[PDB]
């Protein structure tokens, strides 16, 4: 019966997403403008009510200003609204940027808090103290004169929940948030490194205290030495642009960065210095104590005959990810669903444990220390 409630909630949220002047003075604004408005570029403003502009085709004109709002808000470097009759300077353009700003801006917290992963709470406690504490409880930093950390690197074996940690911190926040898969810079475009970078961090500064979240750029740490005999492409120049944007000049502000990698030694050690990126966090193949918690989460709301013990599977083999546990908990459920059965016995878990674990295959010892 709850599905009706969830569907009505989603459709009413869409209804709210659809729920998004002057009788004659606004019509005079409609004649203060020519209706095909345009986008230009101020070069100078000789302030005697006519300005010089620049166009996307490059024709630059003494064009008169028609102020309704304060006309001294717009600057050289800020665009204008020019007509097609005399390209008349119309007025208020709130400062717009690329289309690629709303693209990297997640508008939801679609998943849940630290109650989602199972057990790492020493370093989950670290990212806690380095994001959740400086944001929500910023007492002692002012009260002991000590500045909070800025950069956090996630690494280790993959499928530990780096994505899960990412979305978990994407839950518990009131600061604005941005989602950047930072490897997107494969163009054949010279320049165009700094365009995304400068506009991203300008937007980040203009909105709020925020997190600027780069995700999986472990390939792009291109060895910091050359490309071999002839290489130079743009990629070094773009990462150096991001480096200078981070820890050059022009004080950082209330901007946070969390980063995640699978392999870590192939990175660029001109970034991994503290100050530029502060924290580094290991996510290893955990233990046989929080595997119980990962099975506990993955057997929270599934039909399990409690006769079986997952601790038998934990006692079987000891090195696998929590994603492997999720794969087992779904796959044994499918093996139960072979023949319309209620709950899951032991042997579905056995066949599913064997089934998922077809990963490591090498070879031939060791094995033969011995």
């Amino acid at each position: 019966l709850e599905r009706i409630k969830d569907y009505l909630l989603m459709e009413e949220e869409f209804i709210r997403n659809q729920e998004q002047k002057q009788e004659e003075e606004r019509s005079k604004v409609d004649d203060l403008r020519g209706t095909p408005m345009s986008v230009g570029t101020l070069e100078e403003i000789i302030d005697d009510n006519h300005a010089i502009v620049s166009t996307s085709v490059g024709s630059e004109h003494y064009v008169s200003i028609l102020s309704f709002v304060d006309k001294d808000l717009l600057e050289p470097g800020c665009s204008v609204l020019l007509n097609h009759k005399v390209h008349a300077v119309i007025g208020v353009l709130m400062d717009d940027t690329d289309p690629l700003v709303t693209v990297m801006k997640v508008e939801k917290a679609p998943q849940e808090t630290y109650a989602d992963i199972g057990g790492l709470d020493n370093q989950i406690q670290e990212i806690k103290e380095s994001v959740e504490l400086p944001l929500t409880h910023p007492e002692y930093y002012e009260e002991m004169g000590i500045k909070p950390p800025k950069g956090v690197i996630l690494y280790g074996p993959p499928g530990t929940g780096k994505t899960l940690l990412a979305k978990a911190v994407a839950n518990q926040t009131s600061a604005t948030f941005l989602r950047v898969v930072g490897s997107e810079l494969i163009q054949k475009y010279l320049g165009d490194g700094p365009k995304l970078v400068r506009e991203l961090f300008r937007v980040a500064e203009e909105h709020a205290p925020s997190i600027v979240f780069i995700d999986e750029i472990d390939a792009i740490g291109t060895k910091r030495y050359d490309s071999n005999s002839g290489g130079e492409r743009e990629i070094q120049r773009t990462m150096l642009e991001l480096l200078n944007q981070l820890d050059g000049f022009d004080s950082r502000g209330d901007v946070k960065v969390i980063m995640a990698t699978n392999r870590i030694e192939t990175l660029d050690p001109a970034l991994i210095r503290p100050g530029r990126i502060d924290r580094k966090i290991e996510f290893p193949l955990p233990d046989e104590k929080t595997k119980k918690r990962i099975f506990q989460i993955h057997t929270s709301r599934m039909t399990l005959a409690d006769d079986v013990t997952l601790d038998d599977l934990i006692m079987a083999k000891d090195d696998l990810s929590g994603a492997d546990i999720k794969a087992i908990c779904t796959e044994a459920g499918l093996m139960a669903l072979r023949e319309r059965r209620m709950k899951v016995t032991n042997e579905d878990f056995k066949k599913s444990k064997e089934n998922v674990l077809y990963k490591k295959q090498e070879g031939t010892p060791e094995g033969l220390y011995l």
Partner: protein
């Protein structure tokens, strides 16, 4: 056959709508050209733009 004067007319231009703004208008970037805040027809909603 008399209807075919409508075929005899210049049709339209394509346009990149980056994002709409308040007060019943949108933005349009023409295919090689710059961006242009333009007006809408009576048949289209910004909820659908």
């Amino acid at each position: 056959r008399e209807e075919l004067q409508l075929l005899q007319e210049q049709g339209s231009y394509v346009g990149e709508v980056v994002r709409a703004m308040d007060k019943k208008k949108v933005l349009v970037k023409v295919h090689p050209e710059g961006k242009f805040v333009v007006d809408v027809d009576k048949n289209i909603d910004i909820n659908d733009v």
